[PDB]
Amino acid sequence: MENLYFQGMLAAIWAQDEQGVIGKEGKLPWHLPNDLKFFKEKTIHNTLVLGRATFEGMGCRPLPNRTTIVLTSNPDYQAEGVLVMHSVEEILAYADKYEGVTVIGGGSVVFKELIPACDVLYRTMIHETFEGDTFFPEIDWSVWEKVATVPGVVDEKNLYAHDYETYHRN
Ligand SMILES: NC(=O)c1ccc[n+]([C@@H]2O[C@H](COP(=O)([O-])OP(=O)(O)OC[C@H]3O[C@@H](n4cnc5c(N)ncnc54)[C@H](OP(=O)(O)O)[C@@H]3O)[C@@H](O)[C@H]2O)c1
């Protein structure tokens, strides 16, 4: 037994604007194709954890070739093609014994609860302001430091200046 070790890994990944906006009416308030492609690279063949509201904002659809977990207090919640779990503890138990990375995909409640258990943050900082109703939550930034940053390429498909940032624990 290895009940005294945590042998999995949690990454939180998200895109936000310069106000900290991450969503509006369930959906993304911007379109930035390169970031979606980066996101798929990080989640492909891994596990993606989503709070119920975010999941439903995506039209209740799972991304292929990943395992998605939907978090909800509702014991009877079922959706198509996803695991459903009902507590942080339950998420952590799955993550401990999962062979790949358990990616925390949001939304705000999920980030605030699970970021304390994460080992890395992948943030896409979009340098523009949009209208939204959901913000990245207040977290303890004192335990994190930025270890990498790369500017994103703008083109006819990607309209906004943006940075891809990586944070690790100090
Ligand atoms: N002006 C305002 O009214 C305003 C301000 C902020 C956001 N909102 C809105 O709220 C939504 C999304 O915000 P969000 O990013 O915080 O949503 P989210 O994190 O994606 O999902 C939140 C939900 O996941 C659940 N969950 C999270 N932790 C859990 C736990 N430890 N155990 C069991 N279930 C857990 C709940 O499902 P269950 O509820 O089924 O238990 C919960 O309500 C949007 O639809 C949006 O419009 C509006």
Q: What is the 3-state secondary structure (H, E, C) of 9-50?
A: EEEEEEEEECCCEEEECCECCCCCHHHHHHHHHHHCCCEEEE
In sequence order, which residues have a C-beta less than 8 Å from that of residue 101 and are 6 or more positions away?
A: 8, 9, 10, 11, 46, 47
C-alpha of residue 55 to centroid of ligand 1, in Å: 10
Sheet hosting strand 162-169, strand order edge to edge: 83-85, 67-71, 47-51, 101-104, 9-17, 120-126, 162-169, 144-151
Question: What are the residue ranges spanned by the domains of the chain?
Answer: 1-170
Classified by CATH at the fold level, domain 1-170 comes out as: Dihydrofolate Reductase, subunit A (3.40.430)
How many CA atoms lie within 13 Å of 18's alpha carbon, on the beta-carbon side?
6
C-alpha of residue 52 to centroid of ligand 1, in Å: 7
Of all protein residues, the one whose alpha carbon is nearest to atom 45 of ligand 1 is: 26
Experimental technique behind these coordinates: X-ray
Q: Which residues line ligand 1 (CB under 6 A)?
A: 25-26, 51-54, 71-74, 86-88, 106-110, 113, 133-134
C-beta separation of 60 from 44 below 8 A: no
C-alpha of residue 150 to centroid of ligand 1, in Å: 31
